[PDB]
Amino acid sequence: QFTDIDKLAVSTIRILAVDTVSKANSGHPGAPLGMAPAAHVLWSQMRMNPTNPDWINRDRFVLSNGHAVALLYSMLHLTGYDLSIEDLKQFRQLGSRTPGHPEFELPGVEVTTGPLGQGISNAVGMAMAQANLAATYNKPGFTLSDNYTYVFLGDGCLQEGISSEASSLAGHLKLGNLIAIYDDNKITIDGATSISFDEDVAKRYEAYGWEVLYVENGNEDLAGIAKAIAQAKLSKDKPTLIKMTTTIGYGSLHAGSHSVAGAPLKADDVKQLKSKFGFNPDKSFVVPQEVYDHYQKTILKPGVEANNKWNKLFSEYQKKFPELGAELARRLSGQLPANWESKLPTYTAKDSAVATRKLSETVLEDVYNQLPELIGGSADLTPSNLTRWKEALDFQPPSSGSGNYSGRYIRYGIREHAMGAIMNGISAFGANYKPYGGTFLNFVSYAAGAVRLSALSGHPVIWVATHDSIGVGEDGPTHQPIETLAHFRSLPNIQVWRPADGNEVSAAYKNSLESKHTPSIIALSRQNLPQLEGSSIESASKGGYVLQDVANPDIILVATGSEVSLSVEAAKTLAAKNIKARVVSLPDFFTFDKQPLEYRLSVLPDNVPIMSVEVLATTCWGKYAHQSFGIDRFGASGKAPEVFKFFGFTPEGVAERAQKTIAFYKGDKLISPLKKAF
Amino acid sequence: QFTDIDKLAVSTIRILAVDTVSKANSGHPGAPLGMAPAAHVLWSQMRMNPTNPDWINRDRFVLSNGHAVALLYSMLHLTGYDLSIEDLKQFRQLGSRTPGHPEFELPGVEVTTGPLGQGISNAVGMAMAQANLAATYNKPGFTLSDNYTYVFLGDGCLQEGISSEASSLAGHLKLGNLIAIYDDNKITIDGATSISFDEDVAKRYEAYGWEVLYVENGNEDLAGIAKAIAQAKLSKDKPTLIKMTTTIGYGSLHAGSHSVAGAPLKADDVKQLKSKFGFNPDKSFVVPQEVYDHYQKTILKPGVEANNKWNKLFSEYQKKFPELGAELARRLSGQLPANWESKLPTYTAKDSAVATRKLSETVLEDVYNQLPELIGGSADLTPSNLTRWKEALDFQPPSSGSGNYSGRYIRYGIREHAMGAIMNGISAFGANYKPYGGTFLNFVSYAAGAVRLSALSGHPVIWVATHDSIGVGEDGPTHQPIETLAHFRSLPNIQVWRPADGNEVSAAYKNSLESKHTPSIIALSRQNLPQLEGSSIESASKGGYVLQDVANPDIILVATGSEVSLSVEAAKTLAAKNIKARVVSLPDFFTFDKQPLEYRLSVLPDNVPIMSVEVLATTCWGKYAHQSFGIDRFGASGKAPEVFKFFGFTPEGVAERAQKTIAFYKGDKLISPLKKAF
Ligand SMILES: Cc1ncc(C[n+]2csc(CCOP(=O)(O)OP(=O)(O)O)c2C)c(N)n1
Ligand SMILES: Cc1ncc(C[n+]2csc(CCOP(=O)(O)OP(=O)(O)O)c2C)c(N)n1
Ligand SMILES: [Ca+2]
Ligand SMILES: [Ca+2]
Predict the structure, then answer these.
(1) Would residue B475 be called left, alpha or beta, if left means φ above 0 and alpha means ψ between -120 and 50 degrees?
(2) How close, in Å, is residue B156 to chain A by CA atoms?
(3) Bridge partner list, A581
(4) Which CATH architecture fits B1-329?
(5) Which residues contact B13 (CB under 8 A, 6 or more apart)?
(6) CA–CA gap between residue B106 and residue B93 (Å, rounded)
(7) DSSP labels for B609-677?
């Protein structure tokens, strides 16, 4: 039962959001208006602690329809989080804690949303991670993990294919604790949904194996909303979708019109809303004391006490199960096992020629038992990406008979974008989870919508991208990347590793895993590559270094991945003609650029022509090279070696180009491209 | 009535795909083995003319499951297309006409496929275009258009969200001539579909508004398959999906196993299949004269006859409706109206400041009535993109009451990936279709999969990408592009226009609309930008040009979009301190590089330091400038102006950088970035 106070609270949220959008004269007021009742109802029965937004067993909420942020901020403020009326007053202004879309960095905000379809998929991640933590640490008597994941979504999210891939997989995995509430308001930007969206949403969701509950009166039926949620919590075998009907901008003179969607209400309209809901049409940002008292009482005080009972249970747990408790305590601190990297493979020149894709498999087998937080998977390319260790158990529902929730290997299906957002969700769940997803490097491009958010928010997720170039061969240009690495090297805060051998692959994982705010992409080859003389984890961890050196080089060859070997052979052919070439290996732009300038310039100095070698686009190389040898046209079909010779990438071919670069520059003094003038 | 000859034909096809994959010792034999029966039944009743693959009223077929090419190639050769056994004998080999995945340049091959989800989405575009052409030119007594669009797909395309997107739009539009046949084989790379894809596809498609039919013995029931297709053609108001159950690799000692999915069969295995099927186990690429004759009798000759009939009826149309006949006749030849380019707007330095986003709207207004083949739209951003002319009618089913099929304005909803793919289908259709679609620049990334293929295939589609930068403002970083253009400028064959003003917007549309093999992206501004003195359609069409000139400049400033004007103001500032700046506008890298070197070199000459200016990633600028002033970090939520000032993009701020640049190179000898050594 709700009372007069719940109605006042619902009324304090609606108006506080309006006031928050109006002042910025920028924003979306509609969804927050139409969603206040459901939000009040939902947040009151959510187990959380405004005082500790990181408590691990806290019910997690996600505003997938990111533009309704105003709503979110209102709730965070009213319920006790560190967000004041002042912050609300600097909404959408440069440098405030209240940007136009929820940002992962703010306490109370679980992921960064805004881009449609991304929030709902993150939520699937947060439920897979929960299912796993629970199955891995819960013991009879100690229920350390049992939280739920709540999502708020709109028509847009449901139209973005990414939420379909995610939802399909969520139905398969039988995620009972995932409860999604849909803002069934019948409007989007272009107007009415019937104009391009008249499908049977509930029917499409039942086909995924989800349960669908209806709430016809989302505008006022508090009892029914609270009841829909309750019913949803009893079906632990099917995720639940609640189709709740509401009127966008409810309370405004233009309720139900798309005008209220993405624009502040007219001052005139803001006044009546307030008079209507019983407020003073002349005051702004007014929160009745009784509302504060109510939330302290029903949410903050209880939530705080729930966190207290939990911590001491965890104390008893650590006494009862030392090994498992110490491990969980470690993951909770965010620290990786001690000296874990000591288990990383190393090699020498006498070792065997092996494609880095294979070398990658061997790191996974060696470290998976050292890092209980490593949960991996592939998007239907497991036998190609070699992303699965041997003694692995698939993460599946107990009823599958092909695994269970304690498992750490995920079968994403042919769903690259959803994998991207789901891994973002796993990482964001907490407990030091370290997800990795595999697929072909040219198809990582299908997940750019999510890959950007891992960088923007800083979710350190790992993409194991095999088949990095025309080394793919026969599959042809539809499968050979050309522009991928250049694209990602152009996106801020993301490591794009292209290791050249066993040691460079170890450096890739060491850096990739130790990272706490920077995702990574490891581009691996299909074809066998030899072990280089000069490579090492220590050097390679710096992103770029000098593989082979010569006193007073006539030219410097900068290469990456499969091309470092070719370059080493090109140099041999060059020594033959008395030309001294220094060979620099650059496994990651990101990590290299992070080294102090004095190191970088010792690697790429003045007074020597620098030419770069890589079988892909040359558009990003100007920052380190004087002349670039690469590909700026689509690949071809045919045996891989025949294709490489076709493009000029043979030892002599590169050598010839080195010579032309030296002659072109004789007499000119050169300056390292690393030197910026401002 | 299917007879022994129909059974012989089907065997010849299975064996032919098998011989084809095996000599290549590379390829996917599974689906070709399993879909031979459907391929035979379907093509036998498809209205096509193998001698002229461009007849506009031909029935269209799209192998969405691109990996099953050997099936498409076998069909092409048997039915009388220009493709031979020697070609098939060089399948997957360098420079051959038989690449590992179907390519748009080959006759008989409707569009390029390989990446999952694209093919089924294109077929939708092709069916809309058919609906349009029919509704636009059909007259009582002259059914010029009425062809069907058949598609072959598998679990993979059904798992990729782009297909959920496209099929959701297909059902809304009631695309009745769109018949899809799903290879329901229970297997995918990782293994059994129950492992990660157990949804109720039939129930889901029914929710979209499609009709679902079933054929449970797709391995040997030529009868049911035909009945399903005929039943399909009866529902002229709903697209149909036929769930045809097959066994992967039928005939093989490993049918039903996934080891026959993407690997060639064993020599011993190929033998038992030939014997089992009545063929000789020791011979290759054998086609019984009976099959050639059969397909000549039932497919080629009747289709040729039909093309001829259509040809005669078309000259009657041209006689009856001179104006309309003249129009289609022109479109089917591929010529744009004569002198159309005279209807493009031009401005002068004295015309008010307009956003490049608004200017774009003005062009749409002006050319819409000139180009009947211009079909446009938006992905739920019509009011923000300004992509709809006033007197426009939407493309919809007549029963809607919102428009009809003859309309030219498509409402895509929030489905960016599907839109670029549907655009590819429309363009692919023919009749000089000129589709365009709008969305915020940042989310074009969500559609990267389709875009790559627009470039790869050479489809001249157009993206009206608006809100091109931090100029967007308060929406913040999840909505401001940084890497986007640098990404798309690293992809081969695609124009990335970023017009600075009125004249440059026209130059952008002229070249874009005149393009026959290169797609486009026109990055438009959210904010107002002044008309420049010195810009002009003619010059901007070259992609780059000296906007302002000075004798003996101390520095050359290169900019694009909204930074050209900022650069012009900085030059004023620099002139006051007696520093001569030449300002160059580079509206499009693609177009620029297409110009002769000596012209390019006149724009970016030796001996002068060059500095570029653009509020996006600097990574791609090294091929033109010595020093770049750009933004290599994510953006910010704030008032546009404040964001610009916060990042340093002010008149004196650029001038200050130019001065440091001049200082840094004083005395040095400088070479143009354009000059390459090899
Ligand atoms: C990926 C992506 N595509 C497009 C946009 C632009 N966009 C923002 S809101 C929206 C649609 C309205 O969505 P809905 O969830 O229906 O809205 P509500 O009624 O809840 O405001 C559009 C097109 C975006 N935010 N994300
Ligand atoms: C976008 C994209 N993702 C992934 C792949 C790799 N891929 C090729 S075949 C396939 C799996 C098989 O799909 P299905 O439609 O089940 O084919 P079948 O084996 O039944 O013929 C995948 C993952 C691809 N080609 N493109
Ligand atoms: Ca809505
Ligand atoms: Ca399959």
Answers:
(1) alpha
(2) 6
(3) A555
(4) 3-Layer(aba) Sandwich (3.40)
(5) B32, B36, B39, B40, B71, B74, B75, B78
(6) 15
(7) -EEEE-SS-SGGGGGT-SEEE---S----S-HHHHHHHHT-SHHHHHHHHHHHHHHHTT-----TT---
**For chain B, which residues make up each domain, given as ranges?**
1-329, 330-541, 542-678
Q: How far is CA A10 from CA A22, A287, B183, in A?
A: 19, 11, 52
Find the residues whose C-beta lies inside 6 A of ligand 1.
Answer: A 28, 30-31, 65, 67, 114-116, 154-157, 183, 185, 187-189, 248, 261; B 380-381, 414, 443, 446
- Secondary structure class of B214 (helix, strand, coil): strand
DSSP for A117-132 reads THHHHHHHHHHHHHHH
- DSSP string for residues in A598-648: HHHHHHS-SSS-EEEE-SS--TTGGGT-SEEE---S----S-HHHHHHHTT
Q: Which residue of A has its CA nearest to B191?
A: A380
CATH H-level superfamily of A330-541? Thiamin diphosphate (ThDP)-binding fold, Pyr/PP domains (3.40.50.970)
**Ligand 4 mean position, distance from CA A600 (Å):** 50
With a CB cutoff of 8 Å and minimum separation 6, the contacts of B264 are B21, B22, B24, B25, B26, B27, B29
Residue that the structure tokens 């005669």 belong to: B312
Q: How far apart are CA A559 and CA A614, in angstroms?
A: 6
First to last CA, chain B: 65
- How many Cβ atoms from other residues are within 10 Å of residue A667's Cβ? 7
CA proximity to A401, closest of B17, B396, B663, B195: B195
Q: Identify the active-site residue in A211, A416, A504, A614.
A: A416
Q: Which chain B residues are Cβ-neighbours of A482 within 8 angstroms? A: 491-492
Distances (CA, A) of A676 to A488, A595, B69, B610, B629: 22, 16, 51, 13, 10
User: Which helix (DSSP H) or strand (DSSP E) does residue B215 occupy?
Assistant: strand B211-215
CB A620 within 8 Å of CB B490:
yes
Task: Specify whether the CB–CB gap between A424 and A453 falls below 8 A.
Answer: yes
Contacts of B553 (CB under 8 A, 6+ apart): B580, B581, B582, B608
Work out whether strand B354-355 and strand A178-184 pair parallel, antiparallel, or are unpaired: unpaired
Q: Do B415 and A155 touch (CB under 8 A)?
A: no
- Asked if A416 is an active-site residue, the reply is yes
Query: SS3 string of A263-295?
Result: CCCCHHHHHHHHHHCCCCCCCCCCCCHHHHHHH
Which bound ligand lies closest to the C-alpha atom of B154? 2
Task: Give the whole-angstrom CA distance, residue B61 versus residue B581.
Answer: 57
Cβ atoms of B570 and B580 within 8 Å: the answer is no
What gap in Å lies between CA A131 and CA A146, rounded to an integer? Answer: 8
Say how many C-beta atoms besides its own lie within 10 A of residue A216's C-beta.
11
Same fold yes or no, A1-329 and A542-678 = yes
What is the number of alpha carbons within 13 Å of residue A64 lying toward its C-beta?
A: 32
Could you give the CA distance from residue B407 to residue B393 in angstroms, rounded to a whole number?
5
What number does CATH give the domain A542-678? 3.40.50.920
B249: amino acid identity, one letter: G
